Amino acid sequence: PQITLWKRPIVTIKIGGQLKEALLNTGADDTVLEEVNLPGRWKPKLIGGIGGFVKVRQYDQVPIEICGHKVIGTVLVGPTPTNVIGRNLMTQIGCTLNF
Amino acid sequence: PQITLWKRPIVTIKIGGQLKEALLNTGADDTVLEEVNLPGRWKPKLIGGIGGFVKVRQYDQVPIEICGHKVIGTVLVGPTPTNVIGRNLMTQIGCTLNF
């Protein structure tokens, strides 16, 4: 689809058997979620944002279906305000900016 | 143009007679810059980010030319991991997401 930017570009995702909403964020290198329950090993990561730095769990090779498109990649889990889909996943669904 | 997301979507801007680079950020409601020297009155604002909250100066009706497109809108000035162009300005240049 084409999505305009008069409102937040929020989409429905399925991850780890759970349904969430998340923001398509071209400013984010990475994908950051909260309150998801991912299986298996992870490693600590620190990421920077507006407001400071955040400690997250880094989970690799995680299946996630984003607006009906199945992809796999790294998902960070930690205490973000809104769920964010970053460029690491947006490239996998073929998303571009256009003006 | 069309811009893919394999790298950060960075564009050149002119604001207040100075040249900067900034990140096209569909996750950001607002536009946040640093090191800009804007004229005249401003109001304090607090904004939330993934890592906490930031105190910024809010300047209204600021001319800014973003990749050669002249627009006007609110610009927030304060700390950020990088200069960010948010949806408030991206709608004015007719930017959309497409997948």
Ligand SMILES: CCC[C@@]1(CCc2ccccc2)CC(O)=C([C@H](CC)c2cccc(NS(=O)(=O)c3ccc(C(F)(F)F)cn3)c2)C(=O)O1
């Ligand atoms: C003004 C934008 C503020 C924003 C708003 C988040 C939000 C939205 C709705 C409701 C509440 C909160 C959006 C955003 O992209 C980030 C930053 C980048 C500016 C962000 C988002 C996601 C992850 C990261 N960390 S990172 O390691 O992937 C990373 C670090 C730095 C940058 C850089 F390009 F900005 F430098 C991009 N990515 C940062 C942020 O900190 O919060």
